[PDB]
């Protein structure tokens, strides 16, 4: 990475290089700053009302709360909260501190211990078939912890219920609070219970001496989406200013990347936040504070070639920049012998006025050689020694001698 000659050496995988012209990597520009832009939010999220409530719901009539306009600094749970189970599915736990969330819902209920394994996609049990089910494309996080000192009494707690005896299995996130006598056999039922007609609800016991697996557990399922919409919810990250017309790494509401930010004439709709070009890449975004639209453009753009006479005669080189009109800044070095051919800006060679044959082809009628102190010269190629013919009207040339040639043809 010291110069293009070393790059082509490492490409060819050799310490010597034969004379010619080689193609190198494109002109890369590296960032200088880092930008972060989150919305302007002040309040914290209701971790207390949720995790430290006094009465939780039942698994058949589970509760679903909404979360909006808050900051999710879960570190406040490290003091007195201890979680036995924590599993995230569509996101890694080490990135929950750098993102912003779109439509956050929190589902809460209580079960027995040996059923917590059933809160997951594709589990086929009593809690996943009749009471509570999760999609197969679930994005979110499941949390569970024991509550044998709150939900258990010294004589039996029968205020938590679960649905047995349903006719068909539930669907994702669909609820059922019906209480209609379930008919086991084919004989009809008329609201009376005997020998084939059962009440479809039953209650745990939740004693304080019951063994693990019969002790109560509180569960919380957090559902959300990521990186598609406004996402009024955000995490603990302090923002910076906005730097336009410079190559910067950015983080817009959890979307990372690197580029140049510029103003746009596009006009979005109040339910849009990203641009998503043909190739599914972002090329526009709405700042969550000023509400203005900005474009996004890469920093790397170019095409660079290296002219070499050979590492056994010289170590001077020339460089050709194909997308620069030096008549000047997108260059590695400036040198002192700029030419500006039609195929790009050539840096490292002295332009002459003569016309020889092509030794090293460059493009658009330009060639390069190692002329006479020795240097690199670039010139316009010759086409074959202009001549003329003497056609008057009535004159003819006839030969008076011949030659016998002998030529070779290899095949």
């Amino acid at each position: 990475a010291l110069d293009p000659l070393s790059e082509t050496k490492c490409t060819l995988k050799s310490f010597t290089v034969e004379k010619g012209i080689y193609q190198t990597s494109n002109f890369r520009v590296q960032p200088t700053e880092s930008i972060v832009r989150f919305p302007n939010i002040t309040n914290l999220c209701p971790f207390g009302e949720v995790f430290n409530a006094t009465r939780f719901a039942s698994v058949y009539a589970w509760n679903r709360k909404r979360i909006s306009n808050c900051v999710a600094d879960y570190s406040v749970l490290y003091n007195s909260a201890s979680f036995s189970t924590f599993k995230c599915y569509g996101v890694s736990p080490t990135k929950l501190n750098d993102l912003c969330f779109t439509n956050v819902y929190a589902d809460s209920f209580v079960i027995r211990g040996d059923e917590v394994r059933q809160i997951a996609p594709g589990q086929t049990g009593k809690i996943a078939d009749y009471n509570y089910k999760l999609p197969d494309d679930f994005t979110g996080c499941v949390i569970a912890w024991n509550s044998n000192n709150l939900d258990s009494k010294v004589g039996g707690n029968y205020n938590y219920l679960y649905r047995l005896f349903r006719k068909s299995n539930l669907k994702p996130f669909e609820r059922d609070i019906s209480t209609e006598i379930y008919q086991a056999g084919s004989t009809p039922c008329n609201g009376v219970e005997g020998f084939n007609c059962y009440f479809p609800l039953q209650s745990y016991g939740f004693q304080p001496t019951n063994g693990v697996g019969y002790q109560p557990y509180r569960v919380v399922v957090l559902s959300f989406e990521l990186l598609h919409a406004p996402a009024t919810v955000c995490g603990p990250k302090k923002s910076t200013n906005l730097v336009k017309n410079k190559c910067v790494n950015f983080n817009f509401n959890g979307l990372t990347g690197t580029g140049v930010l510029t103003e746009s004439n596009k006009k979005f709709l109040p339910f849009q936040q990203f641009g998503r070009d043909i190739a599914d890449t972002t090329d526009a975004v709405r700042d969550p504070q000023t509400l203005e639209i900005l474009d996004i453009t890469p920093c790397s753009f170019g095409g660079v070639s290296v002219i070499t006479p050979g590492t056994n005669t010289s170590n001077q080189v020339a460089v050709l920049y194909q997308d620069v009109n030096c008549t000047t800044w997108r260059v590695y070095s400036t040198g002192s012998n700029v030419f500006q051919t039609r195929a790009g800006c050539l840096i490292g060679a002295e332009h002459v006025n003569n016309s020889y044959e092509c030794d090293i082809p460059i493009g658009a009628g330009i060639c390069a050689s190692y002329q006479t102190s020795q240097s690199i010269i670039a010139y316009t190629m010759s086409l074959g020694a202009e001549n003329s013919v003497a056609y008057s009207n009535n004159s003819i040339a006839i030969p008076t001698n011949f030659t016998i040639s002998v030529t070779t043809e290899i095949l």
Binding site: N394, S395, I396, A397, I398, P399, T400, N401, F402, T403, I404, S405, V406, T407, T408, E409, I410, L411
Partner: protein, 170 residues
């Protein structure tokens, strides 16, 4: 190819059968792809070699076993013959050609006019050394005298553009 190693004996020395099949399948896929690429490229090169071989087989027939009249097919100049030589994975042809050497300028005109009748050369062209008029061939200046055997007559002298006046003998 997305695996933990490129050596099957390190994979099989640390991992069991189930964990190792996952890693061996990737290597299999990648190496199969490598061989497919190799074979495709060789199939594309064999075509070039076959075209060159067919052209050489045509040159042997048309330049060695005969005398070609095509231009620039066997040599540079008017073809005479050719000779083959064998080389590793190929062949070499030595083409013998005729090339004119020394040009000289003359003035010329067609349809000579002896007496009311035009005469054409019937092979070759008319030329003049300044005062006299000869007829000669085209690729080697050997002048002859103009008689009624080396020419033929056609029509009268009222149309041709360039016609000149001289004497033809018998």
């Amino acid at each position: 190819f997305g695996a933990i190693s490129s050596v099957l004996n390190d994979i099989l020395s640390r991992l069991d059968k189930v964990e190792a099949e996952v890693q061996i399948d990737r290597l299999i896929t990648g190496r199969l792809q490598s061989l497919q690429t190799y074979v495709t490229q060789q199939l594309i090169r064999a075509a070039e070699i076959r075209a060159s071989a067919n052209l050489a087989a045509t040159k042997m027939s048309e330049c060695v076993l005969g005398q070609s009249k095509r231009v620039d097919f066997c040599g540079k100049g008017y073809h005479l013959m050719s000779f083959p030589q064998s080389a590793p994975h190929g062949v070499v042809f030595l083409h013998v050609t005729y090339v004119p050497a020394q040009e000289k300028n003359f003035t010329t005109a067609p349809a000579i006019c002896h007496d009311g009748k035009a005469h054409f050369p019937r092979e070759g062209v008319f030329v003049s050394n300044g005062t006299h008029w000869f007829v000669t061939q085209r690729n080697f200046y050997e002048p002859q005298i103009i008689t009624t055997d080396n020419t033929f007559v056609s029509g009268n002298c009222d149309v041709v553009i360039g016609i000149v006046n001289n004497t033809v003998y018998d």
